[PDB]
Amino acid sequence: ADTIVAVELDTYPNTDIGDPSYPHIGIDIKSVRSKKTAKWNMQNGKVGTAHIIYNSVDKRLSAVVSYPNADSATVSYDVDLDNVLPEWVRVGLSASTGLYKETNTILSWSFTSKLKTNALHFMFNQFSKDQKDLILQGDATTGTDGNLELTRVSSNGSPQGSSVGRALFYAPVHIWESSAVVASFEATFTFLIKSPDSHPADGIAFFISNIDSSIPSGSTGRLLGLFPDAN
Amino acid sequence: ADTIVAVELDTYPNTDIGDPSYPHIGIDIKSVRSKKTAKWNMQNGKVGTAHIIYNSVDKRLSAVVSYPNADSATVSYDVDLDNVLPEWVRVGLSASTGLYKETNTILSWSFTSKLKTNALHFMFNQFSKDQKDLILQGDATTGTDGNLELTRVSSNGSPQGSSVGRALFYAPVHIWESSAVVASFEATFTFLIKSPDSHPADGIAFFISNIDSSIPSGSTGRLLGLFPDAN
Amino acid sequence: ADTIVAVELDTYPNTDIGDPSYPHIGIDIKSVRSKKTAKWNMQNGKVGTAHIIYNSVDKRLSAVVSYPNADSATVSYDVDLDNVLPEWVRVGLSASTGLYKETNTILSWSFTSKLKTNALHFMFNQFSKDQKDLILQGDATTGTDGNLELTRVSSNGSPQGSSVGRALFYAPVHIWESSAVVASFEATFTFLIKSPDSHPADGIAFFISNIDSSIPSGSTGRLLGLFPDAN
Amino acid sequence: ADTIVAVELDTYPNTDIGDPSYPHIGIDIKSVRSKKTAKWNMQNGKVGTAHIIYNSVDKRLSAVVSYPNADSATVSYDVDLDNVLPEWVRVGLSASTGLYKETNTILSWSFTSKLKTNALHFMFNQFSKDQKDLILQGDATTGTDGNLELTRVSSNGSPQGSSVGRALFYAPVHIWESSAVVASFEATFTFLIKSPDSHPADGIAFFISNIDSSIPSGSTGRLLGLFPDAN
Ligand SMILES: CO[C@H]1O[C@H](CO)[C@@H](O)[C@H](O)[C@@H]1O
Ligand SMILES: CO[C@H]1O[C@H](CO)[C@@H](O)[C@H](O)[C@@H]1O
Ligand SMILES: CO[C@H]1O[C@H](CO)[C@@H](O)[C@H](O)[C@@H]1O
Ligand SMILES: CO[C@H]1O[C@H](CO)[C@@H](O)[C@H](O)[C@@H]1O
Ligand SMILES: [Ca+2]
Ligand SMILES: [Ca+2]
Ligand SMILES: [Ca+2]
Ligand SMILES: [Ca+2]
Ligand SMILES: [Mn+2]
Ligand SMILES: [Mn+2]
Ligand SMILES: [Mn+2]
Ligand SMILES: [Mn+2]
Numbered sequence: 001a002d003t004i005v006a007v008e009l010d011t012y013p014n015t016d017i018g019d020p021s022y023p024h025i026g027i028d029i030k031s032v033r034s035k036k037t038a039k040w041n042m043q044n045g046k047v048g049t050a051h052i053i054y055n056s057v058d059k060r061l062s063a064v065v066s067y068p069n070a071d072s073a074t075v076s077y078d079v080d081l082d083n084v085l086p087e088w089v090r091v092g093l094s095a096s097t098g099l100y101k102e103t104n105t106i107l108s109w110s111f112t113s114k115l116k117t118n119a120l121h122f123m124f125n126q127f128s129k130d131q132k133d134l135i136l137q138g139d140a141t142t143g144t145d146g147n148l149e150l151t152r153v154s155s156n157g158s159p160q161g162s163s164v165g166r167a168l169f170y171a172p173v174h175i176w177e178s179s180a181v182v183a184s185f186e187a188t189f190t191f192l193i194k195s196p197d198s199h200p201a202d203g204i205a206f207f208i209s210n211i212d213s214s215i216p217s218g219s220t221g222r223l224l225g226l227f228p229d230a231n
Numbered sequence: 232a233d234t235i236v237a238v239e240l241d242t243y244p245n246t247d248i249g250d251p252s253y254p255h256i257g258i259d260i261k262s263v264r265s266k267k268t269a270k271w272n273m274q275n276g277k278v279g280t281a282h283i284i285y286n287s288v289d290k291r292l293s294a295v296v297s298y299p300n301a302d303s304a305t306v307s308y309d310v311d312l313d314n315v316l317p318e319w320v321r322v323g324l325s326a327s328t329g330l331y332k333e334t335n336t337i338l339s340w341s342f343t344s345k346l347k348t349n350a351l352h353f354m355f356n357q358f359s360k361d362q363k364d365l366i367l368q369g370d371a372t373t374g375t376d377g378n379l380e381l382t383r384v385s386s387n388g389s390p391q392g393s394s395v396g397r398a399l400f401y402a403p404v405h406i407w408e409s410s411a412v413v414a415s416f417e418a419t420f421t422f423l424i425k426s427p428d429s430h431p432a433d434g435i436a437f438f439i440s441n442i443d444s445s446i447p448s449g450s451t452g453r454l455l456g457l458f459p460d461a462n
Numbered sequence: 463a464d465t466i467v468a469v470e471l472d473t474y475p476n477t478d479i480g481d482p483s484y485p486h487i488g489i490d491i492k493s494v495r496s497k498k499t500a501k502w503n504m505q506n507g508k509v510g511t512a513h514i515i516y517n518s519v520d521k522r523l524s525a526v527v528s529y530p531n532a533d534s535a536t537v538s539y540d541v542d543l544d545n546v547l548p549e550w551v552r553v554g555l556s557a558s559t560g561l562y563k564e565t566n567t568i569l570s571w572s573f574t575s576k577l578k579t580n581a582l583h584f585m586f587n588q589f590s591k592d593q594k595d596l597i598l599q600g601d602a603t604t605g606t607d608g609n610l611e612l613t614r615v616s617s618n619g620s621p622q623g624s625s626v627g628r629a630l631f632y633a634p635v636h637i638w639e640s641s642a643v644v645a646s647f648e649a650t651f652t653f654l655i656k657s658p659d660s661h662p663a664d665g666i667a668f669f670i671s672n673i674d675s676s677i678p679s680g681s682t683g684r685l686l687g688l689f690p691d692a693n
Numbered sequence: 694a695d696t697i698v699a700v701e702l703d704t705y706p707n708t709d710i711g712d713p714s715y716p717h718i719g720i721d722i723k724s725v726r727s728k729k730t731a732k733w734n735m736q737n738g739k740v741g742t743a744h745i746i747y748n749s750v751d752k753r754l755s756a757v758v759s760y761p762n763a764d765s766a767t768v769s770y771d772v773d774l775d776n777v778l779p780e781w782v783r784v785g786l787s788a789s790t791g792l793y794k795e796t797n798t799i800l801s802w803s804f805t806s807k808l809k810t811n812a813l814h815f816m817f818n819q820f821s822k823d824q825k826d827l828i829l830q831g832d833a834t835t836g837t838d839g840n841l842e843l844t845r846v847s848s849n850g851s852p853q854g855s856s857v858g859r860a861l862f863y864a865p866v867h868i869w870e871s872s873a874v875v876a877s878f879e880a881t882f883t884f885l886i887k888s889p890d891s892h893p894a895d896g897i898a899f900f901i902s903n904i905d906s907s908i909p910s911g912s913t914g915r916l917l918g919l920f921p922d923a924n
Contacts, residue, residue, distance in 0.1 A: 057755045066874045088363040123350040132319045132403040171402035172363040181759045293519045297643045550825040581816040594781045594865040633864035634825040
């Protein structure tokens with residue numbers, strides 16, 4: 001199977017796989033069962049901001065998710081990514097729906113990696129219909145209002161159930177190296193999760209993977225397009 | 232055929248295809264016969280710096296090539312790259328040898344493109360044996376002393392004749408867009424051209440191409456790995 | 463007197479001092495009588511964007527001023543800033559009103575200078591009530607809605623006549639050096655010029671000055687807070 | 694008294710004020726008696742690199758000090774800088790000598806601060822004789838070989854005892870804000886500490902201070918130009 005490290009914005013509690021009983025953010029290391037979670041007051045129809053940070057000094061993967069004029073949710077987990085990921089990775093955004101659904105709209109995405117110095121930075125403040133520096137997988141589309149729709153939306157703007165989609169940056173990223181004095185990365189994205197129902201599902205993740213990562217077959221719903229099973 | 236825009240550091244005068252009778256820098260628009268050239272005092276065995284700049288306001292492609300404690304060579308050409316290149320491109324470094332030879336050693340390479348904002352930046356201050364964000368074509372290799380050798384060198388660094396090699400950044404670049412108020416790019420690389428002979432050949436280019444560009448058949452020597460013919 | 467280089471967004475034609483008979487953008491080199499101007503379709507009450515660029519290779523000062531979904535205005539002038547400005551400068555925004563008036567509201571301001579490398583970058587996407595990295599001169603205030611008001615506005619945002627104000631970045635900038643292979647700078651700001659009258663005045667400038675520059679006595683109205691006289 | 698947060702590269706053990714019995718790096722919060730230290734294998738006459746990082750999510754101040762082809766020294770301390778520093782600060786480099794001495798040569802210095810976004814970045818890869826974006830205090834000088842000499846060196850290159858000097862970046866920095874979702878800073882500098890004696894003293898610090906900070910009178914030797922006493 002693929003190797004996944006992810007920050008999940010989990011809109012739907014699957015208590016049977018160790019989700020807490022509320023919308024949450026989590027750090028996932030090679031399992032959909034988050035190593036750590038924090039409560040997340042998701043705001044249906046409001047534009048949110050996610051910031052993810054890691055450096056090779058602290059070896060702490062941290063995420064902050066916020067909306068204007070509201071308290072942030074934050075989660076951190078000590079992990080040595082050198083012992084989990086291959087040296088070269090791709091970075092991406094993933095989303096899913098199941099029997100419940102939501103828009104998984106990305107309005108912007110930036111990423112910076114630095115290895116001491118080699119550097120990579122990309123910034124998307126808009127997505128075009130033919131975004132050739134993105135690998136779109138499953139139901140992911142670009143161009144509609146200059147946004148990235150990770151999961152399927154009908155002609156009338158309604159989100160579809162049992163959908164899964166991902167966008168990976170085209171270039172592989174050197175995420176760690178033994179010869180590195182300091183390695184760091186950050187990602188930011190803005191998202192709009194809307195549900196006609198007051199039961200939205202299933203969420204959005206920022207993930208890092210083996211370069212050849214693809215949607216595991218059947219990874220709709222609670223598996224967020226990341227994992228083949230709930231182990 | 233490919234679509235090429237390039238800045239050439241041409242170490243060998245091919246007077247039969249319109250080269251001036253001295254080492255020169257040139258701006259190449261879809262031809263190896265430079266639209267504009269300037270005299271270049273190439274310094275055998277010394278580390279040089281090349282800077283290339285363009286913005287959609289001035290629509291002027293400019294390059295400066297320099298060595299420490301020596302006068303710069305500079306060349307500029309008015310061109311609307313919107314009318315020459317496709318919207319999506321790859322960016323690269325190319326080098327060749329022929330009957331005469333030289334090391335085509337790259338010690339560092341950076342690039343920034345901005346479309347008003349979407350942005351791409353990479354910086355290589357060292358190259359690793361397995362540099363997965365580079366597409367190596369022909370004789371180009373990485374890892375030897377942390378450098379990028381565009382053309383063939385022996386175990387002792389001695390350069391071989393009839394060699395051609397290129398390195399393209401893995402991700403496609405959005406170099407222009409009609410809805411853009413301002414588009415800009417800049418590139419820097421440091422190079423070491425050494426020749427045992429007092430007749431070095433054939434040179435190094437920074438180039439921008441169609442995303443699927445490859446070394447044209449036969450394009451060793453004066454064609455610099457860029458062009459199928461001398462038209 | 464001070465040494466000024468500026469890009470003016472001139473909302474009010476002073477035909478008696480060589481303004482063309484319409485709102486215009488201009489390049490000012492040590493005089494309010496622009497060395498070059500272009501027609502500017504200023505849009506009362508709409509947020510606009512100004513981009514200013516210069517590099518030591520082309521030695522061309524260029525500016526583009528635009529509104530969403532409208533054609534740009536652009537102006538360029540060939541000037542060797544090495545022969546005009548001192549080596550060390552301050553960078554700033556200036557605005558004035560006279561008998562006629564307008565809001566001179568700055569919503570954002572960024573600047574980058576590079577000398578080949580020494581570098582300086584600042585980005586203001588909001589201004590606080592106590593913005594200690596800004597020198598406010600004359601009527602300029604910060605904090606109201608997180609904006610920079612260069613000229614006087616009432617409690618309800620209504621603009622006052624005979625006002626002049628400037629904001630300079632606190633740190634001096636090394637804009638040129640003889641030992642530099644390449645020097646470049648860029649500035650971006652977003653502005654909101656609103657007038658209850660259909661005769662707005664007098665405009666906004668981005669300027670570069672001697673480090674100790676201050677508002678010349680009397681420099682309200684057509685002198686834009688930049689010049690002691692109309693010579 | 695001033696408010697100081699610093700990372701010290703302490704070359705001289707003052708066992709009487711709680712220094713460990715070896716050259717060390719430390720995190721100083723309003724005292725020269727480091728809240729945390731790590732062993733540092735200082736290499737007389739070799740160019741070293743120091744990296745300092747902090748973000749408002751982890752609230753961890755970390756430093757890594759390294760030489761090429763040697764193991765790094767690293768130190769971290771959990772501190773909420775929001776509870777220690779004023780909102781606006783200056784950032785600087787400090788060094789001292791006492792009865793024992795050393796060159797306190799800075800070859801380069803970069804700093805980035807970001808408040809979510811407002812940003813500040815400066816990079817010095819060389820210092821000029823008249824570096825107007827630096828406030829030099831005490832014995833600090835610029836221009837000699839393009840370096841920053843924090844403490845006094847004689848005409849013959851010999852370091853002098855009982856010397857103290859600092860360089861602060863001219864612009865105040867917004868290092869924290871209550872409305873900030875994420876605040877971060879990083880600093881990098883390269884240094885050359887040479888001693889003829891083989892008993893070097895006293896060290897170099899990166900520090901953050903109240904904007905009006907100045908060398909405490911008598912703060913030569915073990916006080917590193919930062920503190921008035923050893924409390
Ligand atoms: C009720 O179960 C289904 O729907 C939910 C909500 O979408 C998913 O989490 C889950 O994997 C299933 O597809
Ligand atoms: C004279 O013949 C060769 O001359 C140089 C030497 O490298 C090349 O430019 C050219 O294409 C030929 O191969
Ligand atoms: C009569 O003109 C006055 O008003 C205009 C525009 O306000 C200014 O340009 C001018 O200097 C005077 O102050
Ligand atoms: C021996 O004591 C003196 O010299 C050393 C190092 O120079 C300092 O630490 C100390 O403060 C005194 O000035
Ligand atoms: Ca879930
Ligand atoms: Ca040639
Ligand atoms: Ca006017
Ligand atoms: Ca000590
Ligand atoms: Mn979960
Ligand atoms: Mn040529
Ligand atoms: Mn005018
Ligand atoms: Mn100590």
